[PDB]
Write a protein that binds this ligand. Structure first.
Ligand code: MNH
Ligand code: NA
Ligand code: ZN
Length: 187
């Protein structure tokens, strides 16, 4: 798990809960003097432990917190990699380019990142079938990231997530419905 994910998580915790809370989390869940260098890889268990601790403090379902993080994360990533996001003029383009364009670039920017496998298929009625696969099972982070992307393009979406690795499949299916964006009028 790259430092950049931890750095965006810090911004979130610091913004919502305060710096004193982040330092608690970090002292408790990370080795002494840990510093997350944005480009370096770190044990994903440190990220999961921090986020689980937050979920418990807030008495929220863990996957609801991961999803909220995901949505915060989209802007954290777009603002730190603005040249990658500015390759797309709308939400649907970006989603269709996650694998072959965005995460292709992430392999040139970072040494050996740990990324999901994603394939998007355009459906009728302004829907997208996004297939997600990862041993890290962060499909709810992916839901949040899609909601973040929607907000980035002033779009409105809904997601159905009825095949899921957490319910025993070897992939998740996220069926994205684009309800509105700047190029959608009546239908
Ligand atoms: C919506 C769009 C979108 C989705 C659904 C998305 C999906 C994900 C998910 C889920 C993970 C966590 C790991 C896993 O195995 O699931 C992940 C990781 C990552 N992605 Mn992307 N990602 C972006 C946009 C997206 N990515 C953008 C924009 C950037 C920035 C250029 C980016 C860069 C990354 C980096 C960096 C990681 C972390 C890799 C690592 O920790 O080793 N990405
Ligand atoms: Na519109
Ligand atoms: Zn899932």
């Amino acid at each position: 798990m790259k430092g950049i994910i931890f750095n965006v998580l810090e911004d979130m915790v610091v913004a919502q809960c305060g710096m004193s809370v982040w330092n608690e989390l970090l002292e408790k869940h990370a080795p002494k003097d840990r510093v997350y260098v944005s480009a370096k890889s770190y044990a994903e268990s440190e990220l999961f432990s921090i986020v689980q601790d937050v979920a418990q403090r807030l008495n929220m379902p863990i996957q609801d917190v991961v999803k909220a993080f995901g949505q915060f994360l989209f802007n954290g990533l777009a603002s730190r990699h603005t040249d990658v996001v500015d390759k797309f003029d709308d939400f649907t383009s970006l989603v269709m380019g996650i694998h072959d364009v965005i995460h292709l670039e992430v392999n040139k920017l970072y040494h050996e990142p740990s990324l999901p496998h994603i394939n998007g298929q355009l459906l009728p009625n302004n829907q997208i079938a996004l297939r997600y696969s990862s041993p890290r099972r962060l499909c709810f982070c992916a839901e949040g990231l899609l909601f973040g992307a929607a907000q980035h393009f002033a779009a409105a979406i809904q997601i159905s997530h009825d095949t899921c690795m957490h319910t025993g499949a070897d992939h998740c299916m996220l069926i994205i419905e684009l309800q509105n964006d700047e190029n959608l009028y009546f239908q």
